[PDB]
Design goal:
Two copies of one chain form a homodimer. By secondary structure, the first copy, chain A, is mainly α. Chain A has seven helices and two strands, in the order αααααββαα. Chain A has helices at residues 6-16, 23-47, 53-65, 73-79, 90-96, 111-132, 137-154, and strands at residues 100-102, 107-109. Chain A has a two-stranded antiparallel ribbon. The complex binds chloride ion (4 copies). Chains A, B: Residues 24-152 form the HTH marR-type domain.
Chain lengths: 156, 156
């Protein structure tokens, strides 16, 4: 908790120097902690509906980005916020739960899946704005730029 | 990939408006994608040693932050970058693997655990600097501040 013990972690890294700065290690630690904390907040929107983060992401991505016929698996992953083994049986599970359907693959929301997102979105949108709220307009755009810029350097 | 389709995702959110801006949703999507991509890069340091992200984090946190007697479970979680169900049997597994030991709990590196981190750290440190490399001194510190600032708002 806090920046309480960033100083402790900073001085701990300094002891490893035996005769450069700790910024990069601290910055990544902070983003990692931020990723977890953001997870917690965003989760509340849909935890009671029985969804997890991978499930909500897939549903929401279809809601915003699927055309009426749906999205194919390549497209879908390219448009979703979350990828990786974290998302292994998300489609299987959501099919199971009646919230998405297939057609010819090609995936879309069922009516129950769409009403569900429609009902949660206002709170998801509220939480999204609330977690960024400590930051101004510049700052938010700056965060945007730096993240895109870092992210660009790694996308290969 | 790219900012190629941020514009697609931005116009997709705009269609949801029926009569505010998409920044927050895009910013969080970007941090989420960044978290995954960073994961991939950092992973290479220790994937061949058989570690995963939770395992490496625990070992490294001891390396930098444990005193000679080791760290108790509260302390350890407070000093580590990663928390949550992601880290459930990390201690069990690392004990199993001979890299950490207990004593009276209280956890520390075994000699094999310490040599392992000692050997990987240079590459972990290299990767850490490399993924932040697209950004300047200001920028890195700015990212640091904004993340801490967001993270502070959520730590309760
Ligand atoms: Cl994140
Ligand atoms: Cl999204
Ligand atoms: Cl991250
Ligand atoms: Cl660390």
């Amino acid at each position: 908790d806090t920046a309480a013990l960033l100083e402790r972690i900073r001085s701990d890294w300094a002891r490893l120097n035996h005769g450069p700065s700790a910024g990069p290690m601290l910055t990544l630690l902070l983003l990692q902690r931020l990723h977890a904390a953001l997870g917690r907040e965003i989760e509340r929107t849909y935890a009671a509906s029985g969804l997890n983060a991978a499930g909500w992401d897939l549903l929401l991505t279809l809601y915003r980005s699927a055309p009426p016929e749906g999205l194919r698996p390549t497209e879908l992953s390219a448009l979703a916020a979350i990828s990786g083994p974290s998302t292994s049986n998300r489609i299987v599970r959501l099919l199971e739960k009646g919230l998405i359907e297939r057609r010819e693959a090609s995936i879309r929301l069922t009516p129950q899946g769409r009403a569900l997102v429609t009902h949660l979105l206002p709170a998801h949108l509220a939480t999204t704005q609330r977690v960024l709220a400590p930051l101004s307009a510049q700052e938010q755009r700056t965060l945007e730029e730096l993240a895109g810029r870092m992210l660009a350097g790694l996308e290969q």
